[PDB]
Amino acid sequence: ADVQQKLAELERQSGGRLGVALINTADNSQILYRADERFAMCSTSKVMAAAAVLKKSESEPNLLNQRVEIKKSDLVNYNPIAEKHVNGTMSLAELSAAALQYSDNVAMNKLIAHVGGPASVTAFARQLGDETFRLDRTEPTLNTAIPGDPRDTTSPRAMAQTLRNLTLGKALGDSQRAQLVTWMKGNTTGAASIQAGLPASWVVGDKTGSGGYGTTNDIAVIWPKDRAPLILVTYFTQPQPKAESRRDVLASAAKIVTDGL
Ligand SMILES: *[B@@]1([O])OC2=C(C([O])=O)[C]=[C][C]=C2[C][C]1[N]C(=O)[C]1[C][C][C][C][C]1
């Protein structure tokens, strides 16, 4: 109850809406705050798309080495890796890493397309028992994050449970799980978010997200020092369409829910 009040006060000062889901796998205890409300996933959805490709590769062993053409007309708003490979190709492995570790939007679009479109990424979540996740649009419009819009949303509880199944559970084959975890542990975008609220000695694999209405997200699997692993989802969105990102809010939330662990 103390943590709930701290998160409520953090939220008040932030001026936005905060969603938190922490799963402690030591005993399956949880800290939940607006955990059943819907939030625009933004780029945190790229974990689901990469996972669906990994699942597909479980029956197509050389799948991750297949080449995908990168076209100039594919470039959108944020293409840090794909812009370097225009007029060439990238493997699905490289596209998965680019989406997860640099939040490349072209890579996400290639991941979505390869599994049949957003409805197939959603079908994958259903296959995992996730009835809340829904992916409706491609990059970049899936990040609009309009209040009241259910497109491209999920709840902190649903994503925390699915991330547990993906990174610590049996959603993926163990070889594919290891690749997903390795990729997420190599993320370059998360130093100011969840990671920033945890001790430096803790190992973090995370995927961040940014969108309209100042939406600022992060989902992580965490191996604390001398503790069982944790799953943490911190979603944050704001009332103003042009609101600025608040990664500091996610760091504060992580510090609050891990205080005293
Ligand atoms: B995605 O949300 O991830 C992302 C991030 C991040 O990881 O927080 C940072 C910068 C760009 C991206 C690409 C994805 N978000 C968007 O494309 C979004 C950026 C702000 C305006 C609306 C589109």
Residue numbers in the entry: 31 to 291
Please give sentences taken from the publication describing this entry.
However, their continued use is jeopardized by the increasing spread of resistance mechanisms, including that mediated by β-lactamases, which, cumulatively, can hydrolyze all classes of β-lactam antibiotics. β-Lactamases can be divided into four classes (Ambler classes A, B, C, and D) and manifest considerable sequence and structural diversity as well as different, but overlapping, substrate profiles. Among the SBLs, the extended-spectrum SBLs (ESBLs) are of particular clinical concern. Of particular note are the CTX-M enzymes, which have become the most prevalent ESBLs worldwide. Cyclic boronates act as analogues of the first tetrahedral intermediate that is common to both SBLs and MBLs.
Crystal structures of cyclic boronates 1 and 2 in complex with class B (BcII and VIM-2) and D (OXA-10) and PBP-5 from E. coli have been reported; however, structural information on inhibition of the clinically important class A β-lactamases, in particular ESBLs, by cyclic boronates has not been described. We thus worked to obtain a structure of the ESBL CTX-M-15:cyclic boronate 1 complex, which diffracted to 1.95-Å resolution. The overall structure of the CTX-M-15:cyclic boronate 1 complex is highly similar to that of the search model, with a root mean square deviation (RMSD) of 0.194 Å over Cα atoms. Analysis of the electron density maps clearly reveals cyclic boronate 1 as being bound at the active site via reaction with the side chain of Ser73. Aside from the covalent reaction with Ser73, cyclic boronate 1 is positioned to form hydrogen bonding interactions with the side chains of Lys76, Asn107, Ser133, Asn135, Thr238, and Ser240 as well as backbone atoms of Ser73 and Ser240 and two nearby water molecules, waters 4 (Wat4) and 116 (Wat116). In addition, there is a hydrophobic/aromatic interaction between the side chain of Tyr108 and the planar aromatic ring of the ligand. Interestingly, and as seen in the CTX-M-15:avibactam complex, a water molecule is observed in the CTX-M-15:cyclic boronate 1 complex which occupies the same position as the water responsible for hydrolysis of the acyl-enzyme intermediate in CTX-M-15-catalyzed β-lactam hydrolysis, Wat4 in Fig. 2 and S6 (35). A structure of the CTX-M-15:cyclic boronate 1 complex reveals a conserved mode of binding for this inhibitor, very similar to our previously reported structures, with a tetrahedral boron center and the closed bicyclic scaffold maintained as in our previously reported work. Comparison of our structure with that of CTX-M-15 in complex with RPX-7009, a boron-based SBL inhibitor currently in phase III clinical trials, and a TEM-1:boronate complex reveals a striking similarity in the mode of binding for these related scaffolds. Against TEM-1 and CTX-M-15, cyclic boronates 1 and 2 show potencies similar to those of avibactam and BLI-489, with IC50s of low nanomolar to subnanomolar levels.
